[PDB]
Design an enzyme around this catalytic site. Structure first.
Site, PDB file in Angstrom:
ATOM      1  N   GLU A   1     -58.989 -15.411 -10.314  1.00  0.00           N
ATOM      2  CA  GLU A   1     -58.936 -13.997 -10.597  1.00  0.00           C
ATOM      3  C   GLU A   1     -57.798 -13.289  -9.830  1.00  0.00           C
ATOM      4  O   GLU A   1     -57.201 -12.322 -10.357  1.00  0.00           O
ATOM      5  CB  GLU A   1     -60.282 -13.339 -10.215  1.00  0.00           C
ATOM      6  CG  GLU A   1     -61.534 -13.957 -10.857  1.00  0.00           C
ATOM      7  CD  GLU A   1     -61.714 -13.525 -12.308  1.00  0.00           C
ATOM      8  OE1 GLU A   1     -60.724 -13.098 -12.939  1.00  0.00           O
ATOM      9  OE2 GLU A   1     -62.842 -13.606 -12.827  1.00  0.00           O
TER      10      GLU A   1
ATOM     11  N   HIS B   1     -56.913 -14.002 -14.534  1.00  0.00           N
ATOM     12  CA  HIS B   1     -57.740 -12.837 -14.819  1.00  0.00           C
ATOM     13  C   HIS B   1     -57.439 -12.407 -16.249  1.00  0.00           C
ATOM     14  O   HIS B   1     -56.290 -12.174 -16.592  1.00  0.00           O
ATOM     15  CB  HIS B   1     -57.369 -11.704 -13.861  1.00  0.00           C
ATOM     16  CG  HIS B   1     -58.352 -10.578 -13.838  1.00  0.00           C
ATOM     17  ND1 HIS B   1     -59.703 -10.780 -13.665  1.00  0.00           N
ATOM     18  CD2 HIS B   1     -58.173  -9.234 -13.896  1.00  0.00           C
ATOM     19  CE1 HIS B   1     -60.317  -9.609 -13.612  1.00  0.00           C
ATOM     20  NE2 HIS B   1     -59.412  -8.655 -13.747  1.00  0.00           N
TER      21      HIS B   1
ATOM     22  N   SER C   1     -63.100  -7.166 -16.797  1.00  0.00           N
ATOM     23  CA  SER C   1     -62.493  -6.450 -15.681  1.00  0.00           C
ATOM     24  C   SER C   1     -63.058  -5.011 -15.626  1.00  0.00           C
ATOM     25  O   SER C   1     -64.268  -4.846 -15.488  1.00  0.00           O
ATOM     26  CB  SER C   1     -60.962  -6.474 -15.822  1.00  0.00           C
ATOM     27  OG  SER C   1     -60.321  -6.129 -14.593  1.00  0.00           O
TER      28      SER C   1
HETATM   29  C1  LIG Z   1     -56.025  -4.031 -14.026  1.00  0.00           C
HETATM   30  C2  LIG Z   1     -55.943  -5.142 -15.042  1.00  0.00           C
HETATM   31  C3  LIG Z   1     -56.972  -6.030 -15.299  1.00  0.00           C
HETATM   32  C4  LIG Z   1     -56.856  -7.172 -16.342  1.00  0.00           C
HETATM   33  C5  LIG Z   1     -57.428  -6.703 -17.770  1.00  0.00           C
HETATM   34  C6  LIG Z   1     -56.417  -5.947 -18.609  1.00  0.00           C
HETATM   35  N1  LIG Z   1     -56.863  -5.422 -19.835  1.00  0.00           N
HETATM   36  C7  LIG Z   1     -56.068  -4.692 -20.714  1.00  0.00           C
HETATM   37  O1  LIG Z   1     -56.550  -4.262 -21.765  1.00  0.00           O
HETATM   38  C8  LIG Z   1     -54.687  -4.481 -20.318  1.00  0.00           C
HETATM   39  C9  LIG Z   1     -54.219  -4.992 -19.134  1.00  0.00           C
HETATM   40  C10 LIG Z   1     -55.044  -5.754 -18.229  1.00  0.00           C
HETATM   41  C11 LIG Z   1     -54.485  -6.347 -16.841  1.00  0.00           C
HETATM   42  C12 LIG Z   1     -54.607  -5.212 -15.773  1.00  0.00           C
HETATM   43  N2  LIG Z   1     -53.035  -6.752 -16.959  1.00  0.00           N
HETATM   44  C13 LIG Z   1     -52.806  -7.919 -17.974  1.00  0.00           C
HETATM   45  C14 LIG Z   1     -53.674  -9.092 -17.545  1.00  0.00           C
HETATM   46  C15 LIG Z   1     -55.162  -8.716 -17.445  1.00  0.00           C
HETATM   47  C16 LIG Z   1     -55.364  -7.571 -16.436  1.00  0.00           C
END
Ligand SMILES: CC1=C[C@H]2Cc3[nH]c(=O)ccc3[C@]3(C1)NCCC[C@H]23
Ligand SMILES: *[C@@H]1O[C@H](CO)[C@@H](O)[C@H](O)[C@H]1NC(C)=O
Ligand SMILES: *[C@@H]1O[C@H](CO)[C@@H](O)[C@H](O)[C@H]1NC(C)=O
Length: 529
Positions: free
Chosen positions: A324, A437, A197
């Site tokens: 996603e 995602h 991401s």
């Molecule tokens: C913006 C975002 C993108 C994804 C990647 C991510 N990565 C993290 O470290 C913490 C939260 C999150 C997210 C928030 N929330 C948990 C599920 C995955 C997503």
């Protein structure tokens, strides 16, 4: 002693950690910059002053100050992503997992977390590098970097809050790794940065930025691309958001210096409390403080850089997950809930469309709606739910990534594309969310190899396959075991593979039908109208 390492910044003492009935060394919480506190808040990171004595690198460090997800208190699904250590602006540390016995000069992988540039921690259980380090015999590093306003408040022109400092934090950690990883048995010339991401967008940004290119060899991008619509803003929008933040905390807005001083006198949580108030539109998959196209870190716009081949030329491995968009529709779009199948009405579908493409005018919203509606069965709640899921995923992750891969491949030295579509048997999120995602990460980090985690034998085998693909690519620039096939993605054929527990299948032109709409038609329509 294997747990003792002398680096250019000083001596560090690690700890032994058990892993799959064996053990490896871990140096947790190694500082790579001076604490970005007080007058240093918003400023570019300062390199860490060397220390005498031995630094205790036996325990995880603090996590950077960030928005904490309390949408489902107690729910493992969301809690597993929240900070699992005390938060603190003193959070610039990195973690290293080293195979035992210590290697002499082996493949290094550096992980970059990606919670939309507003959250993330290098200490999450799902980010434990011990399984990958151990299984693939690589030195695994996870870095950290300031998120939210702390890492991306941007008042272009001032040297106090220039913007992009969180990306500079990443770059400093990559520099430290480049300068010291040899002491832990890693080959500094064979470093692969990988992230998911915002971490994936970050990886692409280091490929683009001249000042970051020499610090690594190869790159892996998971569900994130530098050109993602949410991954950056103009200098003007960044400035507007910084001013709006100040306005939310009743700051003097007479000058940049006045605004910055006020923001530095506020406690971390006060900034976090009003962070989401500065977005320009009601929207989903949009975050407040993100990288800014400034002319320094990014010499020119991303598209012209991509178009002219102005970027590091090497091999890349990247891909996307099947659904996603589901996470972002759950957190915001009318009609979606965690405990129902979330069948969507025609009316909520349209509300969703508007939240998903906030920058579009009515004609643009009509174009999207037309494109994702089955007009023979337009009141089918399942179809509306799934179409919205695709809109969000296509617009925010897949199509931007496909545009990046196609632009990159014209000048790169090797591309490998994947499509991850396996829904984990032990997933606690509702079924309607599909292959979510961020959920390929646990396979990349090998959690399925841990019995107590309850994965199937097939899943464990998938994780091993993926870890070996990632590690072999990191070592050779090709995920395939020499003389042992994941085909190379080319401009012409555009082949890619599925990643699941069924027998590998090769496909071509990933969602080309929808990406021609998002990458070629819609932009054209919004510009003409
Ligand atoms: C913006 C975002 C993108 C994804 C990647 C991510 N990565 C993290 O470290 C913490 C939260 C999150 C997210 C928030 N929330 C948990 C599920 C995955 C997503
Ligand atoms: C820090 O290292 C010391 C040994 O020098 C160890 O006893 C301690 O547990 C480590 N971390 C803690 C618990 O603060
Ligand atoms: C990568 O570069 C080498 C030499 O620079 C060349 O021999 C090889 O064909 C290139 N590989 C790809 C996939 O472009």
């Amino acid at each position: 002693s294997e747990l003792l390492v002398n680096t250019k910044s000083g001596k560090v003492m690690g700890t032994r950690v058990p892993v799959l009935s064996s053990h490896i060394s871990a140096f947790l919480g190694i500082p790579f910059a001076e604490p970005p506190v007080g007058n240093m808040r918003f400023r570019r990171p300062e390199p860490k002053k060397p220390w005498s004595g031995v630094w205790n690198a036996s325990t995880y460090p603090n996590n950077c100050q960030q928005y904490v997800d309390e949408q489902f208190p107690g729910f493992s699904g969301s809690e597993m992503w929240n900070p699992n250590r005390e938060m603190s602006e003193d959070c610039l540390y990195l973690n290293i997992w080293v195979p035992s016995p210590r290697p002499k000069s082996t493949t290094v992988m550096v992980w970059i977390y990606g919670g939309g540039f507003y959250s993330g921690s290098s200490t999450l259980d799902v980010y434990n590098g011990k399984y990958l380090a151990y299984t693939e015999e690589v030195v695994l590093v996870s870095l950290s970097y300031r998120v939210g306003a702390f890492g991306f408040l941007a008042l272009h022109g001032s040297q106090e809050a220039p913007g992009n400092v969180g990306l500079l934090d990443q770059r400093m950690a990559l520099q430290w790794v480049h300068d010291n990883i040899q002491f832990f048995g890693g080959d500094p010339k064979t470093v692969t940065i990988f992230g998911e991401s915002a971490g994936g967008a970050s990886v692409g940004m280091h490929i683009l930025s001249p000042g970051s290119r020499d610090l690594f060899r190869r790159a892996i991008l998971q569900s994130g691309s530098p050109n993602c619509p949410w991954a950056s803003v103009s200098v003007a929008e960044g400035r507007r958001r910084a001013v709006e933040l100040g306005r939310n905390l009743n700051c003097n807005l007479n000058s940049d210096e006045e605004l910055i001083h006020c923001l530095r006198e506020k406690k971390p949580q006060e900034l976090i409390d009003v962070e989401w108030n500065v977005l320009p539109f009601d929207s989903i998959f949009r975050f407040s403080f993100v990288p800014v196209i400034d002319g320094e870190f990014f010499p020119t716009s991303l598209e012209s850089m991509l178009n002219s081949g102005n970027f590091k030329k090497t091999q890349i491995l990247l891909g996307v997950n099947k659904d996603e968009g589901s996470f972002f529709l759950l957190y915001g779009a009318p009609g979606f809930s965690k405990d129902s199948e979330s069948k969507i009405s025609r009316e909520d579908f349209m509300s969703g469309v508007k939240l998903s493409v906030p920058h579009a005018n009515d004609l643009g919203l009509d174009a999207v709606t037309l494109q994702y509606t089955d007009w023979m069965d337009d009141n089918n709640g399942i179809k509306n739910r799934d179409g919205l899921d695709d809109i969000v995923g296509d617009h925010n992750v897949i199509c931007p990534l496909m545009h990046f891969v196609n632009k990159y491949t014209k000048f790169g030295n090797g591309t490998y594309l994947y499509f991850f579509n396996h829904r984990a048997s032990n997933l606690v999120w509702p079924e309607w969310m599909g292959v979510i995602h961020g959920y390929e990460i646990e396979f990349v980090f090998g959690l399925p190899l841990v019995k107590e985690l309850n994965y199937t034998a097939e899943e464990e085998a998938l994780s091993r396959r993926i870890m070996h693909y990632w590690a072999t690519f990191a070592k050779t620039g090709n995920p395939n075991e020499p003389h042992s096939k994941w085909p190379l993605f080319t401009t012409k054929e555009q082949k890619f593979i599925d990643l699941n527990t069924e027998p590998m299948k090769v496909h071509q032109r990933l969602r080309v039908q929808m990406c021609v709409f998002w990458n070629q038609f819609l932009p054209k329509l919004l510009n003409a109208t």
